[PDB]
Every structure is written in C-alpha cells, then in structure tokens.
Design a protein around this ligand. Structure first.
Ligand SMILES: Cc1ncc(COP(=O)(O)O)c(CN[C@H]2CONC2=O)c1O
Ligand SMILES: Cc1ncc(COP(=O)(O)O)c(CN[C@H]2CONC2=O)c1O
Lengths: 359, 359
C-alpha cells in the first residue's frame, strides 16, 4: 500500500520562521538546513522559506546543491571550507564562510579571487570543537581584516555547548568570552541557535541560527516539545500495516523472543524498520499510532518491520495507516521513550522513505 | 568530496557469495539486498553479483528499482505484496512473492493474469512476525495449490528468530515445525539466512538467503567478525579531519561538556556525524582510525562532526584520512563498543554519504 513516508508540513515550517522572528525581533535568520534539513529535505526546506536571511549548511557540497536547485539566498558555511582550491567557487557562488583555522586564513591571504568573500570568524568560547582560541583570536582576527579577499568588516560567530542547561554557568561564560572579544569590533555577531534563541535573549545579537526548533522540535531533553514555544511540528513519519495476525498467550515475538504475550491477542506488522531510519533501540512499549490510536511496539524493531500489539479482537486490517510520529505523537515523546535524541531521530533517516510535502 | 564516503569493495562481495556456496554447496542463493543492500547500494550490489540465483527485497519498490536498473535475475518479495492491484506488475516483472495472509491468497485466487506467478508460502514456525500459523497452514497451502495464477509447485519459506543463540532450542523447534509441514510436499524449501547458513547445516535445504554475512559482517553478537567465517568486509565508512586544535587540561569537549581532558593535548575534528549515519550513541573512547592509527572519540557525537583525541604533539593535520570502520577496524568492533547492532550500523546511514566502488 503506502510504506515509509516522511510528510513535511510547509505551513508549519513558515509559521516557525515567523514565530522565531517574534522571539528574536531584532535578529536576522540563518535557517539551518544541513543534514538534508534535519531529515525534512535540504532543497524543499529552502524553497519553503524564501524569507530567511540566509541558509546554513555543514559542508560545501550542501551549499552547492542549494545553488543547483535554484536557491539564490546567501548560504553560510558553518564549518568553513576544507580545501583552499574551493575559494574561487565560494567567491563566485557568494557563499559566506566561517574561518576557524590557519589553513583557511592563509588560503584567503594568498588566493586571487575576482570577488572578496564575506567571512564569519569562528571563535572558540568554551565548546572546544571548532574555532580560534581566545589567546590566538586577536592576531588571527587582524589578519582577516587585512585581507583583500575578505569582505569587510569580518563577522564573528560562535556556538553554545550547553545552552539547554540553564542551571550551570556554561552559557554565561561563553557569552562573557564572546562579548570581550567583540568589544570595539564592527561586523555582525552570532552565537545563538535553537537553545540560545529560546532561553537566552542576551545571546540574540545580530543573527540567530535556528535549527531544531525551526522544524517544530524542542532542543531540550526536559520533555518539552516544539509547541511549548509556539512552534509547530513539521515532520510526520508514517507507514502502513502489512499484516494483522492472531497470536497466543505465552508466545514470543521477534528476534531473541524479547517479548512474550500474556494473553491471546492480535499483532500488527508495520512497514517500518531501522532500514528506514526508525531506531532499533526502541523498546517494547514504545508508542505508535494505528488508525489514530496508540498501540505498543512488541519485540525488537527489525530492519524493515515493526510489530505492535493491537488487542484480541482489534479490527485493524493490513493496509491501515500508521504514525511513527506526527499528529498526536511528538517526536520528543519518542525521544523520551527510546532515549534517543530527537535530533538524531528526525535526522538519521535513510533514502528509503518517500518524501511528501503538504500545504 | 573526501568527506563522508562509503567505500564498497566489489571483490570482497563476490568472494563472499562464492565462500557461502562452499558452506552451503547444495543450496541456491537469494542475495538479500533490501534496505539499500544493507547500506552498500541496492543496484550496485546486484550488479556485482550476477551469479546470485535470485535477489531478495523487503518491498515491491526495491524490486522495481532493480528492474529499472537492468537487473533481470529473479527477485523475491520477502514480505509479499501489499496491494492486490500490484499482481499484474509482479506477474509481468517475473517477481517471486511470499504469501502470508488471506488478502494475498484471495487476491491470487480472483485476479486475472497473463501469466502465473511463482510463490513462496510463508510459514510462521515460531518467530511470530509474518506467516501462516501451523493450524491454518494446510488449508491455506491447498488453496495456493489450486490457483491458476500460481505457478506450481508452491514453494515454502520461513525465518529464524534466534539462530544466533545455539544454546536455546528455539531454532530446532522451528525446524521441527518446518519439517513437519513440508513432509510429502514438492516445491523448494527455504528457512535459513546468515545465522542458519553458518551455524545450522540442517537448515540449508534448497535455498538459503544470505544477508548480513554476504557483506562480510557477522550475524552474531559474540564479538565474531565476517572473517571468522572466511567472509571479507565489503564496506568502509571513511572521512577526513577538518581541524586539528590545541586543547588544555581540565577543558571539556562537545555538547554537555561530557568529556574533560586531564592533559594538554591536540584534538581532531572529523567530517562525520549522525547526520551521515554514524551512531550518536557512540561513547567517548570509541575507536576511529586517523592516518591508520586508533584514536578515541571524545565528547558527544554531533550531527556533522566528531572529535577525537590525537595527543599533545600529534602530527595529524586537517585533510588527513579517517576510518570510522573498514580496514583495520571491523564494524563488529564498533558494534561492541557502542552497543549498537552491526545490522543497524551499516544500514541506518543517510543519503549524505557519498558512495564509491572499488576493486
Ligand atoms: C554552528 C551551528 N549553528 C546552528 C546550529 C543549529 O542548532 P540547533 O540545531 O540546535 O538549533 C548548529 C547545530 N549543529 C548541531 C546539530 O547537531 N549537532 C550539531 O553539531 C550549529 O553547529
Ligand atoms: C526473510 C529474511 N531472509 C533473510 C534475512 C537475512 O538475514 P540476515 O542478514 O540475517 O541474514 C532476513 C533479515 N531481515 C532482518 C534484518 O534485520 N531485521 C530483519 O528483519 C529476512 O527477514
């Protein structure tokens, strides 16, 4: 019938972008669409959001697919470029780039481009992933200022490591470091993504980079959902039953006989598995909606199939609609039940699901 | 380009099919290529194995992509068809199909096809996922036998739920049930996949369906690898470093500051994350190969990046080769370290990874 299908709500997506402008009314928006737009579709998510001030990607590849698809809006390379030979491209495509290491800076200093490139110097303010450390930042920053190939002024970007943990002073320390370096400097400032936007109004500055929350999903693991912030869930992972079978008490289900029935019942088989992106870690009891009502997963999640307990006289039939997460079942709820981060749930899906866009 | 790349060894793949024929010398092969050939590529895995007796898929869509790509060899629909209206296509495409429920049988009984379809009746011998239960099997089987649309004789297929657990008598019980039903019946018999092939020579029968082991990966969670059975690993998940940075003692790394360094060291940043398919569940300490030597992951695995500890004077530079798993690092080893099944590791990868084929 219909199998593994990801349904993307274009109206929810536009709503969230506008909703986020209301939360950060003095900041421009970098719609973060990396990793196939967190599973919602790189190009379609961008086509949906022409109001974005820019689009953010992880890799140069992603930026080029945007251009290839007709996106004209500025694209920000959050990780910068990996090869000095890519600068002519980046210049001609009008891609904005982060600059975090000596290789990139030296590259910019000796390249010969027909046009200078807007840059966002990435400062390491405490996460210690990418970026120039405080003691090397000033000298590094000054070189970018002297580059004929760098469009002036140079902008400043950083990222939070624990913005979702308001109780520890990590975020305030990163802000302290961020603010100290930006003092007296021109050029746009940006450090906040979903968590910074929602919980830290002092971190909005000139540009904010909504990612997870843009898709109506919460960046926090406190069982809050996108709706807690007025953002609507964009994605629905759906499928269908391919079988409804009789089952006896005492009989196990699935690999390892992991689950045993204590009653005669009817089981439903869903055309969904980890070969589609659904977490194999999902325990028996995890909720799924069959014909709009919640039923539990029973036994191990397999590569292409998932079994659920329908009840002894259920009436559900093969071909009926199944919702892995969507309307009536937030992905955050799944995240909680399976202990899998919502970020990974919506993002680590395979090419086997169909993509569908509505309204 | 040289970022998230899955390298597929075509020579290892051919070697494993031949190696398996040596283990099951009197059985035909159904090369199971469902779920994008377990992450190795549906069409390319099929193109490199023209010696297979048939190809097995989960869904009808997968079978059609094989035909669309030029594969002419028989394709077995392990889950059968989900819509009675698909029978005319299945007949014309010469797809073999499993039949596990009333819907499919009744569909075959009343459809009008220009040619009959070869069928594999699915018998539920104990896994209780798909298949006709023992008490309903005889009547169900007889109807398929009387179908003008079913090519005679009808074949019989089943699947093991615990073939990897030789201790418990689950597999022997499924065999007992399987053998009892097949007595006196013509038509091919098939119940064994990777585990059955390797550990149960009494389950080989007429056709065996190698899946996991075909890709040189072990179906067991006992630390064994594909090489334990003479099968060579087909896949290599590779990438590159995009940064090598200084780091100080007492400083945390990544989201949640979950790893703290007890020494001044140098960290490497890999262009790999769960947005590519790499498990977010990977703990600090999980091994990765940088320039051929093993280094530990430190801090949470992010969507697009992974940090590793290189050492205080490590000579590694951005752009250097990184191996997530492949030569010198079996996926089974990463399975063990992360507690993620090897099946899911190789299969639940996203479309962001580039596919490369070698000899
Ligand atoms: C630099 C940057 N800006 C914005 C975002 C968007 O964050 P939210 O998703 O939280 O809004 C990310 C997230 N990249 C994250 C996503 O997961 N793993 C990462 O490393 C980021 O790295
Ligand atoms: C019907 C059938 N045949 C063969 C196999 C091959 O198994 P191996 O890889 O073990 O050999 C599977 C596994 N499908 C598995 C994959 O994991 N989940 C499943 O349902 C299967 O369902």
């Amino acid at each position: 019938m219909q199998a593994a299908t990801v349904v993307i709500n274009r109206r929810a997506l536009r709503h969230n972008l506008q909703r986020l402008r209301e939360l950060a009314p003095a900041s421009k928006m970098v719609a973060v669409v990396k990793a196939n737009a967190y599973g919602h579709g790189l190009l379609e998510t961008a086509r949906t959001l022409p109001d974005a001030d820019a689009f953010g990607v992880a890799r140069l590849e992603e930026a080029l697919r945007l251009r290839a698809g007709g996106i004209t809006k500025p694209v920000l390379l959050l990780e910068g470029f990996f090869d000095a030979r890519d600068l002519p491209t980046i210049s001609a495509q009008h891609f904005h780039t982060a600059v975090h290491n000596e290789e990139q800076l030296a590259a910019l200093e000796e390249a010969s481009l027909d046009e200078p490139v807007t840059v966002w110097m990435k400062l390491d303010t405490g996460m210690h992933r990418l970026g120039v450390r405080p003691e090397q930042a000033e000298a590094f920053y000054h070189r970018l200022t002297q580059c004929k190939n760098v469009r002036q002024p140079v902008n400043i970007v950083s990222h939070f490591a624990r913005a979702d943990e308001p109780k520890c002073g990590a975020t305030e320390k990163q802000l302290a470091i961020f603010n100290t370096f930006c003092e007296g400097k021109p050029g746009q400032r940006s450090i906040a993504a979903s968590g910074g936007i929602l919980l830290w109004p002092q971190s909005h500055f000139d540009w904010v980079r909504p990612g997870i929350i843009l898709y109506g999903v919460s960046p926090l693991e406190d069982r809050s959902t996108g709706a807690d912030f007025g953002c609507q869930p964009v994605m629905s992972l759906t499928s269908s039953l391919i079988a409804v079978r009789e089952h006896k008490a005492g009989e196990p289900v699935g690999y390892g006989g992991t689950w045993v029935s204590e009653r005669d019942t009817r089981l439903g088989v869903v055309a969904m598995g980890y070969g589609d992106g659904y977490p194999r870690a999902a325990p028996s009891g995890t909720p799924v909606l069959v014909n709009g009502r919640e039923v539990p997963i029973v036994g191990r999640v397999a590569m292409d199939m998932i079994c659920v307990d329908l009840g002894p006289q259920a009436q559900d039939k093969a071909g009926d609609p199944v919702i892995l997460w969507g309307e009536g079942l937030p992905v955050e709820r799944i995240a909680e039940m399976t202990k899998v981060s919502a970020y990974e749930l919506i993002t680590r899906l395979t090419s086997r699901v169909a993509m569908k866009y509505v309204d």
